[PDB]
Design a protein around this ligand. Sequence first.
Ligand code: NFU
Ligand code: SF4
Ligand code: F3S
Ligand SMILES: [Cl-]
Ligand SMILES: [Cl-]
Ligand SMILES: [Mg+2]
Lengths: 583, 263
Amino acid sequence: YPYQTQGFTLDNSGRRIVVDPVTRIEGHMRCEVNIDSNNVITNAVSTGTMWRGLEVILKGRDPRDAWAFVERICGVCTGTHALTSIRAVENALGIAIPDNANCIRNMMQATLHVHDHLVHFYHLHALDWVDVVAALKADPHQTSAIAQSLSAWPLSSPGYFRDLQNRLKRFIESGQLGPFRNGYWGHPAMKLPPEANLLAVAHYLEALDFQKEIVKIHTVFGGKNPHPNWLVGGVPCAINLDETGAVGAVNMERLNLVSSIIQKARQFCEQVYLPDVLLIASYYKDWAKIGGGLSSMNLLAYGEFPDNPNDYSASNLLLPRGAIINGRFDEIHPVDLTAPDEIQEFVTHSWYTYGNGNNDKGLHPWDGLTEPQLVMGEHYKGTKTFIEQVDESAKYSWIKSPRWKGHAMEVGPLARYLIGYHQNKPEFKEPVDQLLSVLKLPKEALFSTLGRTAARALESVWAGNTLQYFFDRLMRNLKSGDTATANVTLWEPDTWPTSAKGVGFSEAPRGALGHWIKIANQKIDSYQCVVPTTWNAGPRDDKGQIGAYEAALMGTKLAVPDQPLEILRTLHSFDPCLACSTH
Amino acid sequence: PRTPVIWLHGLECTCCTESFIRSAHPLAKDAILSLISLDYDDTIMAAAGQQAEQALADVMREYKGNYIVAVEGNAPLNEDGMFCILAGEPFLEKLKRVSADAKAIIAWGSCASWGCVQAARPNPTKATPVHKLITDKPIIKVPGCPPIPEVMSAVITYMLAFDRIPPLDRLGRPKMFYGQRIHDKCYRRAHFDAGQFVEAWDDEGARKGYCLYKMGCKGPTTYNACSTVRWNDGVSFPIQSGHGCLGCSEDGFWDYGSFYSRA
Ligand code: NFU
Ligand code: SF4
Ligand code: F3S
Ligand SMILES: [Cl-]
Ligand SMILES: [Cl-]
Ligand SMILES: [Mg+2]
């Protein structure tokens, strides 16, 4: 059925390219696309290739333990799941956490945002835009000069570049490229000179060394990264600055370390990451017109970083909350997770069931159901052990299809950054505006793979500042004699309602995350997760309506079809995490 | 020449790969460029799709019988292995094919070693660890969710330097790091021994560094180096930062009862 849904028009004839495994993402995806005779994508298909089933594993466990299980949904997006879980439980039981706990949590979430975004740009996304071998051609003296006219970052000596270049050369000439093996070097879509190439590669390596630090903030408060620890009722990292056993607690020496790290992280995002995006952007300026997909039309975010504790009102969430529809940015609709007709996920084109004939019907997560049913349809190609080609007319992903009042949405940095922009908050508007001015592009350039990538960088700096801000607030708490870290009044389960519903939410690095728990007889009854990459990588629905990922591949021209570098760019710009998507 | 290492991802949350890069001495940069050849790795490798599979075939064919397979994640058995699908094929085949020609196998993390969270009751995906599937090759289990960054790196640098499999225990864990209980080298132990406990969060005990045993710490049943090597450049470890050991390096810790119970 050559049919048309949302601006785009979909054709299932023409050549069919396959990308499996999709690398430089978390976990397992499979993309399939169709091209026309002219090498333009007439169809795009997003298949999640894994599942583990926490939604099921949590039945009948202690709601206090929940965060530790759901934490292990994902080690890249680390802690955003735990944080949501505790919020959800706390929400249900009515627990109020103290100010210092709300501070520390927000610091740890901000630390994630910074760290994740940085590791993602360099170590997942960059090699779509950076020719590593090309870098061997470069002149160190210019490379330095470029990197120095780009920023005040001190690691720029020509000697440092020569030496790294010679190291890189020996690596490549060794004939053991490791991660660079059979990479897309020389591709015609690679578009930056050897100087900007060597530069990026150096920063790639510097980032790989430095990222390891940023996460020590998690280490101090959470105990370890990845997979730090959290607590229903507050935080475990109890504070004791000045009295006798302070060595067994968060004290002045720990807080000093944390302070010290924050400053380094913001410095790295401010002087290294964001600039290199502006340099790299400038060469790929036409990628401002590729990969909008849903971004120009439909956006969603739940907000994040409550300033005052226990107020999850939009009024108090530093990161924007809201919902856009059909390019109506004048009308930024507010978001309600209790509402049952509001926030839903269909399985119509996904390998789960909802019972017979209710396959077309969509479910709010308090009623949601994760029961798997693997079955391929009529136009399927392969066996039970093999997949030559997926049948998208039927069920085709391990990812559920989430919708907001029946509209397919795009979530993530760009989404918040757009909502906050039209909410007219200058903490987002101005830095977005100044980015456009330097690249000499208009508002609409944001609606693209390039804009989506810019949005992420802008946030790492913002998130850095927020991190400092919540450290600054923790400190004014302690100066004023508030050192409390945990409410323990409902820590005992015999103190709980006999049954209770709850919603936990967060704005994770990749987008809008929610957990819809039900407690009953001191045990978990429901537990349902709708995670950001679920929204984005989600298959189609009852309506036949496509998701953010598929939509964004749609206009794309494949310079070389055998080597789909172009598809990877767009897909990587959404920061895919499929563990995260499927749970 | 550098020892080639093929790093596979099965069912997993990618967390031991994230842990590995947190290594400080040696830097994961310095491992990648100078100690090993990280020849296939879903998470960071430039190549995708056919180009990615080709690159693997290249290194197996070429470095056959001499390469090390690192496995993070485990393999689901139910629905004929299609709860985890790499290049149109269940992960289980890909594992068997790659490890048949390998010199030795490192099982990173609790997923590959035991099952971890996907394998917690009622384990719908029938998630099954490496050593229950590959049984004709030597397996080093380096467990924990995740392992300690500098443990992972020290295991590799040891094997390269001494050209040996390190001494394993009954479970296949390098004794060097998994030989002693967290609790038998814990700093808060003095307090345990003198009955000084955190009884509830943020009590005088907690703020004084008291033993977390009553708050459900599983350090006394749990082998890892967390109390000694510690996490992230030895900055801290779960207990030091106020929370009891989860027992995350041991088999079945998810179904060992609650995390906040004494067991
Ligand atoms: N950000 C982020 Fe994660 Ni691997 C996703 N999707 C989160 O929940
Ligand atoms: S905190 Fe845990 S490992 Fe440390 S002394 Fe107490 S019970 Fe033992
Ligand atoms: S959770 Fe893991 S890191 Fe150590 S203290 Fe317990 S074994
Ligand atoms: Cl260093
Ligand atoms: Cl070298
Ligand atoms: Mg779900």
